[PDB]
Amino acid sequence: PFVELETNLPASRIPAGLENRLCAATATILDKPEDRVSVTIRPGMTLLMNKSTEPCAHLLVSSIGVVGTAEQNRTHSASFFKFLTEELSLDQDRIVIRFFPLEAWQIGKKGTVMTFL
Amino acid sequence: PFVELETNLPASRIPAGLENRLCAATATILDKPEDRVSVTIRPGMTLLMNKSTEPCAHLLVSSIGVVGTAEQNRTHSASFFKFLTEELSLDQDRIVIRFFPLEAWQIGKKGTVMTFL
Amino acid sequence: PFVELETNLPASRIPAGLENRLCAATATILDKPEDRVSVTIRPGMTLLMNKSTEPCAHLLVSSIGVVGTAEQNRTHSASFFKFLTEELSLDQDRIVIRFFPLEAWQIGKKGTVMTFL
Numbered sequence: 345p346f347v348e349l350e351t352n353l354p355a356s357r358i359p360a361g362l363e364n365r366l367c368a369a370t371a372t373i374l375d376k377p378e379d380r381v382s383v384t385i386r387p388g389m390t391l392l393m394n395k396s397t398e399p400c401a402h403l404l405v406s407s408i409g410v411v412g413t414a415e416q417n418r419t420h421s422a423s424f425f426k427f428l429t430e431e432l433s434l435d436q437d438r439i440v441i442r443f444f445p446l447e448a449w450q451i452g453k454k455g456t457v458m459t460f461l
Numbered sequence: 462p463f464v465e466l467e468t469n470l471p472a473s474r475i476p477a478g479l480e481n482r483l484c485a486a487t488a489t490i491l492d493k494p495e496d497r498v499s500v501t502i503r504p505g506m507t508l509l510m511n512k513s514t515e516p517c518a519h520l521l522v523s524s525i526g527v528v529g530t531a532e533q534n535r536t537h538s539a540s541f542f543k544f545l546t547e548e549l550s551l552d553q554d555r556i557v558i559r560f561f562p563l564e565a566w567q568i569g570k571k572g573t574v575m576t577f578l
Numbered sequence: 579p580f581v582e583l584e585t586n587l588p589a590s591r592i593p594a595g596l597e598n599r600l601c602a603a604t605a606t607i608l609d610k611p612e613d614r615v616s617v618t619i620r621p622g623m624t625l626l627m628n629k630s631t632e633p634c635a636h637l638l639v640s641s642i643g644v645v646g647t648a649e650q651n652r653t654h655s656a657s658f659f660k661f662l663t664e665e666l667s668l669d670q671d672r673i674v675i676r677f678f679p680l681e682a683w684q685i686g687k688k689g690t691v692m693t694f695l
C-alpha cells in the first residue's frame with residue numbers, strides 16, 4: 345500500500361513518528377504486510393477546505409484490491425479518520441480521504457513489477 | 462472536487478488568495494458546490510516543461526462524473542487555462558492540466574465515504 | 579509523459595540537473611518525444627519505506643498507452659531503476675515506482691485537451 349498525508353500544517357507541528365504510527369495503522373486497517381507499506385508526508389503545503397485555510401489534511405490511500413468498494417472503504421475511512429483526527433488534532437470536517445485501487449502490473453520494484461515477484 | 466496546483470514558482474511569487482479565487486473558479490467551471498471544492502497549492506517545487514525550467518504549473522482536477530470525456534474537459538481546460546494564465550502570468554505553453562474522474566466510494570468524509578452521505 | 583520524483587532527500591542533496599537527465603531518460607525509456615515530457619521533483623518530504631526513514635524515493639510515471647502492461651512496465655522499471663539508483667545513490671530496496679496510464683482526453687494543453695491537438 346501507499347499512504348500519502350498532505351497538510352497545511354508545518355512540519356514542526358506534525359507529531360514526531362507520525363509516519364511510523366501511520367505505517368502501522370495502515371497495515372492493520374487494510375490488512376496488508378507492514379513492511380510493504382509506504383508512507384509519505386507533505387507538510388506545509390497550502391490547503392483550502394470548505395473555503396477555509398485553517399489546518400486540514402488529505403489522505404491518499406492506494407492499494408491492491410482492498411479499496412475498490414464503498415463497502416470496505418467505509419470501514420477503512422472510519423479507522424483512518426479515528427487515527428488522523430486523534431494524531432493531528434483536527435476535526436472530521438478538516439480531513440478528506442481518497443482511495444485509489446491499484447494492480448501489481450503498475451507497481452515497480454527491484455527493476456521489474458509486482459506481477460513478476 | 463479536488464484541485465491541485467503545483468508550480469516551480471515560489472510561494473512569495475504566488476498571488477495572495479489564489480486558492481480562494483481558484484476554489485470559486487472551480488465550482489463555476491465544473492458546476493459543483495463551492496463549499497465542497499478542495500484546493501491545494503504546492504509552490505517552490507522543481508518543474509521542467511518542454512525541456513525548460515522557466516516558471517510553469519500543473520493543474521490536477523479530480524471530480525465525480527464531470528471530467529470523464531474529451532467533450533467536457535475541452536470546455537473545462539479552456540476556462541482553467543484562461544484563469545491560470547491570467548492569475549499566474551504564464552503563457553499557455555507553461556501550463557498543463559490533468560483530469561481524474563472519481564467515484565463517491567473512493568472519497569472519505571466524516572468517518573465514512575460519500576456513498577453513504 | 580509525466581514523471582514525478584518524491585524523496586526524503588533534501589534539495590541540496592539532489593544532483594543538479596537531475597530533472598534534465600531524468601527528462602531525457604524518460605523520453606528514451608518510454609519512447610516519447612523529449613519536449614513533451616514533464617518532470618517534477620518534490621525533495622525534503624517525509625518518507626518511510628520498509629518501516630525505515632533512511633533516504634528513499636518514489637517515482638510516478640504517467641503516460642499514454644505505454645505503461646499499461648506488466649510486460650512493458652518490467653522493461654521500464656529496469657531502466658528507471660538503473661537510472662535512479664545511479665543518480666540518487668540509493669539501493670533498489672529504497673526506490674518504488676508506480677505507473678499510471680493516461681488518455682489524451684484527460685490531458686489539458688493550450689486551453690483544450692490532447693484529444694483536439
Ligand SMILES: *c1cc(-c2ccccc2)ncn1
Nearest residue numbers: 345346376377380381382451
Ligand atoms: C503496498 C503493498 C505492496 C506489497 C508488495 C509486496 C508484498 C506485499 C505488499 N506493494 C505496494 N504497496
Ligand SMILES: *c1cc(-c2ccccc2)ncn1
Nearest residue numbers: 462463493494497498499568
Ligand atoms: C468534490 C466535491 C465533493 C462533494 C461532497 C459533498 C457534496 C458535494 C460535493 N466531494 C469531493 N470533491
Ligand SMILES: *c1cc(-c2ccccc2)ncn1
Nearest residue numbers: 579580610611614615616685
Ligand atoms: C506526455 C507526453 C505528451 C505529449 C503531448 C504532445 C505530443 C507528444 C506527447 N503529453 C503529456 N505527457
Ligand SMILES: [Cl-]
Nearest residue numbers: 354355387388
Ligand atoms: Cl513545513
Ligand SMILES: [Cl-]
Nearest residue numbers: 352390391397
Ligand atoms: Cl493553507
Ligand SMILES: [Cl-]
Nearest residue numbers: 345376407408
Ligand atoms: Cl497493496
Ligand SMILES: [Cl-]
Nearest residue numbers: 471472504505
Ligand atoms: Cl516557496
Ligand SMILES: [Cl-]
Nearest residue numbers: 469507508514
Ligand atoms: Cl524548477
Ligand SMILES: [Cl-]
Nearest residue numbers: 462493524525
Ligand atoms: Cl465531485
Ligand SMILES: [Cl-]
Nearest residue numbers: 588589621622
Ligand atoms: Cl529540501
Ligand SMILES: [Cl-]
Nearest residue numbers: 586624625631
Ligand atoms: Cl523521512
Ligand SMILES: [Cl-]
Nearest residue numbers: 579610641642
Ligand atoms: Cl504520453
Ligand code: NA
Nearest residue numbers: 355358385624
Ligand atoms: Na513531517
Ligand code: NA
Nearest residue numbers: 390472502504
Ligand atoms: Na502558496
Ligand code: NA
Nearest residue numbers: 507589592619
Ligand atoms: Na530539486
